[PDB]
Design a protein around this ligand. Structure first.
Ligand SMILES: [Mg+2]
Ligand SMILES: [Mg+2]
Lengths: 359, 359
């Protein structure tokens, strides 16, 4: 009935779109007898300016002690020439690690009202609805050893290590099987098991877990083939599970295929703590304060918060329905504007979503 | 005026399409005062059946002593349950290493006659014409150390090493710069320099080579952004250079974006020896001997052989022009057939190309 939510407004358009999502979350939850206590905490450039680091401990503490975390965006010109460990992005890596949210869920859907935004033909883009479950805190991005060394003659050698232990594969796979159960019951595990030992172990562990989720249809696909299949017939996918680097690449491809980056939400889940919910778009510093931002991705991230974070299915559906009503009514922010629709600002789009909720 | 060409017919539709490309190469060459000595040598399943290994030494020798190598296809059901080092695919890895062809060139072009084959809208697909220059013999596919080990806890850990030495990056970059010079003078180097040390070194070496090719416009792009840009605006690319694993993924994405896999040729180039030229499609064992294969990719691979392998540009243009004429005249094999066109078999398509050359 009452949940604790940490808000991380962050940078650029972050505070603006989180403020709207906060209100939508309140109203939708209210209609299901659910109430929230919100606390805003610093992260990213906002934290750098206020505290001097991208992620203060107080923010980690508040996040960990809450039921779920809703983040806006991170990044800005001001901090782009900071040392690496003091860049806003570092705070995002750090809070994922601290919350142990190893599972990144990014749903790529093409909404009926926005089909023509995709560069894919209508009959190919219409009905696309897939979920990339990406291992988020491990693999080659974090693997050791790594470096640039000067070998025995004058010459530099640069190296990185793709590495996963069995338990890291198991836990991301389990989340993917559970996620397929909340969707259409089809899971495609994507790897390079024809050449990489790390992928051979990936496929071995996923294959072994299949018997524990016998209700889910499991298939396997190579990464380069998945990159082709997303272009040729993306409607074939329900849920995809893959490692960090392949998930990064394939999800971004899928996101672009839908055609509307400003619409796309994300969830980052752990085994037993609060999840982290965030739009995948950036901080869009050039339109900050100009009332142009698309709040719908953050609103849909609050819907994922309710569904995947708190198990509040009905409240989440209320949010998703109201977004569809706003789009059905012809309202579009600039990034999704098309002839014959109603171009609106961030605030007005937020207002239109709120009325369908409260209708 | 006389060149030595090694033919590697290989498996499935390989022999069929190489035999046609051989003749097209002969005729086009003839019209430019160029003649060829051809020798066929075993590789793949054909070598396995004949000699017992995927790549006999005699084939390496013949290839190395020739001016260029034209390969058909490799693979088949018969040998799929062979141990790894005796699979047909091993022979392809082995001949690339032996020939030291570290540069894989894959042109993704959407031909005007075949635009509707792409799942991308016509206005996006029309005019796509890019070249992926992929490092072919190094990186994580071949990197050490690698394996699946059992650690401390009795738990398996799987790992691989993405590694490049400076000289490996320099030589693939140089080929890419030289390739952009033969195209539109634009080179986009693709990496993950925001996170991988190996990519930091990649970007450092490519950036340093720019001053030696000041005529070429160099830009840099992250891999996940490139995967998006191929979907959103593939016409923006001329030449791309990238490492083995990223090149594999992005080229396959680009191939699918063109819509017609059976049309796509490839070249693998070395510093000073014979190149290896091959269609990117597989051996298609289900249509072998049925006169259904599309010979055009192999024919266009022979055009790359002339141009990139031997510097015979006019003869290469003769081949390319004849393919366009065949297509303009409405001829289509099954894989590129559309309503209103003339469905033909492999032989007849070959004949139409040959007619156009010899006129
Ligand atoms: Mg990305
Ligand atoms: Mg491939």
């Amino acid at each position: 009935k009452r949940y604790t939510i940490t808000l991380l407004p962050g940078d650029g358009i972050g505070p603006e779109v989180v403020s709207i999502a906060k209100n939508v979350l309140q109203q939708a939850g209210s209609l299901e007898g659910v109430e929230f206590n919100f606390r805003e905490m610093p992260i990213g450039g906002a934290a750098l300016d206020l505290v001097g680091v991208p992620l203060p401990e107080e923010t980690i503490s508040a996040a960990k002690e809450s039921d779920a975390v809703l983040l806006g965006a991170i990044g800005g010109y001001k901090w782009d020439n900071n040392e690496k460990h003091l860049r806003p992005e570092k705070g995002l890596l750090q809070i994922r690690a601290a919350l142990k949210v190893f599972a990144n869920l990014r749903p790529a859907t093409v909404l009926p009202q926005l089909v023509d935004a995709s560069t894919l033909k209508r009959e190919v883009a219409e009905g696309v609805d897939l979920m990339v479950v990406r291992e988020l805190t491990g693999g080659i991005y974090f693997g050791e050893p790594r470096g640039i060394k000067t070998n025995e003659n004058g010459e530099e050698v640069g190296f990185n290590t793709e590495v996963y232990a069995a338990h890291e594969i198991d836990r991301i796979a389990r989340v993917a099987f559970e996620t397929a159960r909340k969707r259409r019951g089809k899971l495609c595990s994507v790897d390079m098991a024809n050449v990489l030992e790390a992928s051979i172990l990936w496929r071995k562990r996923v294959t072994a877990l299949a018997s524990e989720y016998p209700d889910v249809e499991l298939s396997h696909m190579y990464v380069d083939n998945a990159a082709m299949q997303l272009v040729r017939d993306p409607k074939q996918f329900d849920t995809i599970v893959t490692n960090n680097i392949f998930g990064d690449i394939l999800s971004d491809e899928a996101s672009m295929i839908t055609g509307s980056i400003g619409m796309l939400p994300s969830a980052s889940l752990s085994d037993s703590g609060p999840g982290l919910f965030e739009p995948i778009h950036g901080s869009a510093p050039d339109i900050a304060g100009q009332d142009k931002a698309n709040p719908l991705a953050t609103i849909l991230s609050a819907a994922m918060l309710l569904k995947y974070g708190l198990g509040e299915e009905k409240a989440a559906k209320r949010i998703e329905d109201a977004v569809l009503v706003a789009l059905n009514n012809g309202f579009r922010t600039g990034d999704i504007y098309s002839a014959g629709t109603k171009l609106v600002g961030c605030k007005e789009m937020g207002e239109e979503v709120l009325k369908s909720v409260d209708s």
